[PDB]
Amino acid sequence: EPRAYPFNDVHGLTLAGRYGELQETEPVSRVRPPYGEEAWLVTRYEDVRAVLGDGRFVRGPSMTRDEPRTRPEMVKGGLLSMDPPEHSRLRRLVVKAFTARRAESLRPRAREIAHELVDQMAATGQPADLVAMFARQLPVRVICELLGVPSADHDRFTRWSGAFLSTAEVTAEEMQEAAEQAYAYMGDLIDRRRKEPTDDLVSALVQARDQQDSLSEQELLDLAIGLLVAGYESTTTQIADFVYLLMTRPELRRQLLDRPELIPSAVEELTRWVPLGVGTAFPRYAVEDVTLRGVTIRAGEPVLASTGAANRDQAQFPDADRIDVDRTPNQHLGFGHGVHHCLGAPLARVELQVALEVLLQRLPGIRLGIPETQLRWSEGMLLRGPLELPVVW
Ligand code: HEM
Numbered sequence: 001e002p003r004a005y006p007f008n009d010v011h012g013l014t015l016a017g018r019y020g021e022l023q024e025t026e027p028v029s030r031v032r033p034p035y036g037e038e039a040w041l042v043t044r045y046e047d048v049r050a051v052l053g054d055g056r057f058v059r060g061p062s063m064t065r066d067e068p069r070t071r072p073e074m075v076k077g078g079l080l081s082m083d084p085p086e087h088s089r090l091r092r093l094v095v096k097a098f099t100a101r102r103a104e105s106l107r108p109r110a111r112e113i114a115h116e117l118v119d120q121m122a123a124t125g126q127p128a129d130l131v132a133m134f135a136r137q138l139p140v141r142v143i144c145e146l147l148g149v150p151s152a153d154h155d156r157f158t159r160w161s162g163a164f165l166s167t168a169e170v171t172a173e174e175m176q177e178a179a180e181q182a183y184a185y186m187g188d189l190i191d192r193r194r195k196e197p198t199d200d201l202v203s204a205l206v207q208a209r210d211q212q213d214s215l216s217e218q219e220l221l222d223l224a225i226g227l228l229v230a231g232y233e234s235t236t237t238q239i240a241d242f243v244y245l246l247m248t249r250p251e252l253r254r255q256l257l258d259r260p261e262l263i264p265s266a267v268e269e270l271t272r273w274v275p276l277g278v279g280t281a282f283p284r285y286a287v288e289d290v291t292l293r294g295v296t297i298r299a300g301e302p303v304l305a306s307t308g309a310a311n312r313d314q315a316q317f318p319d320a321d322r323i324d325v326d327r328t329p330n331q332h333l334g335f336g337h338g339v340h341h342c343l344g345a346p347l348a349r350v351e352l353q354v355a356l357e358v359l360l361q362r363l364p365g366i367r368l369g370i371p372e373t374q375l376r377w378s379e380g381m382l383l384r385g386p387l388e389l390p391v392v393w
């Protein structure tokens with residue numbers, strides 16, 4: 001009686017119909033994922049928001065439970081693995097360094113980088129893979145700027161990061177090697193900035209105080225790396241998906257060309273609309289019994305709260321399936337909700353606005369280089385997006 005989950009076809013960005021159906025008739029329902037525990041699946045915008053924001057649903061048991069998931073091999077730890085108060089402490093310190101202003105200050109470099117990337121892509125000739133040449137390039141490089149990795153080092157570092165993508169074609173031996181390398185490198189860099197502070201995120205992380213309390217050498221390392229993993233795959237896949245949408249929907253492209261100042265609010269709207277995850281990601285566990293739409297979730301059970309479904313809930317967004325770049329209000333859960341809500345959001349927004357702005361300015365007539373139906377989609381199973389987006393212009 002639990003439904004096989006996930007419901008989404010990875011071959012595209014379609015939101016499965018099961019979701020809407022369950023929002024009507026079974027808003028708290030049972031699912032069996034391909035790996036880990038059978039779980040509750042919550043699909044209404046209201047209930048998903050409730051779950052993500054309730055002190056009774058925790059992440060700490062993730063370290064010691066077989067989480068419902070679409071992959072076999074699980075990455076654990078980081079901030080997404082912690083509860084208040086331990087989480088609060090680390091999060092307080094990080095966001096003191098990692099301000100909205102710091103996010104904004106990187107806009108110019110993000111533009112330079114995107115432009116250079118479009119330069120290298122143009123140089124290969126048409127068709128050109130926008131996935132490999134731009135999408136998988138821009139966010140890791142922006143992360144390098146943010147952190148304060150010297151430019152001489154961006155290429156080597158970018159290359160180490162590629163092994164952490166769910167779509168990477170690599171051995172466990174190949175991957176440890178890259179991990180040990182990025183760790184060793186991040187550590188040295190942290191040491192250097194502590195001895196000799198600059199204006200980069202690493203320096204500000206080293207010097208962040210929250211009343212007498214500070215980040216340890218271990219917390220600083222794990223955090224720097226955590227931001228790269230949190231900030232890379234997601235933003236890459238989201239740039240890809242967004243441009244896919246741009247190239248397949250004439251009205252979407254025409255409005256952003258006519259009024260580039262709509263790009264920000266379009267980024268919001270696409271963030272709501274694109275159901276980015278194969279599944280729901282990041283199960284919450286009940287610390288005690290909880291009743292929701294009249295069903296009792298018992299203490300210790302996992303809960304999958306689908307932001308992808310939430311964001312297309314007809315009860316919260318008028319004509320939820322329509323892409324309206326002018327949507328007001330637009331309180332989507334694209335970037336999570338509650339204490340774990342994406343701490344990279346301000347930067348992510350900057351990158352997404354910049355990828356669209358620059359792509360549109362340089363290749364206003366960029367479009368698929370092959371039929372939509374021939375597109376090869378990623379079967380990495382964490383996120384949904386093209387493995388290759390060949391484009392012409
Ligand atoms: C388009 C790109 C991105 C998307 C769609 C995205 C989405 C999200 C979402 C939905 C969450 C909350 C998940 C949950 O509560 O289970 C989250 C958390 C997080 N994000 Fe992002 N994010 C993006 C970019 C970034 C970037 C660029 C960074 C780093 C600079 C970043 C750092 C983090 C971190 C550290 C967390 C965990 C925060 C916590 O647990 O307190 N993200 N992200």
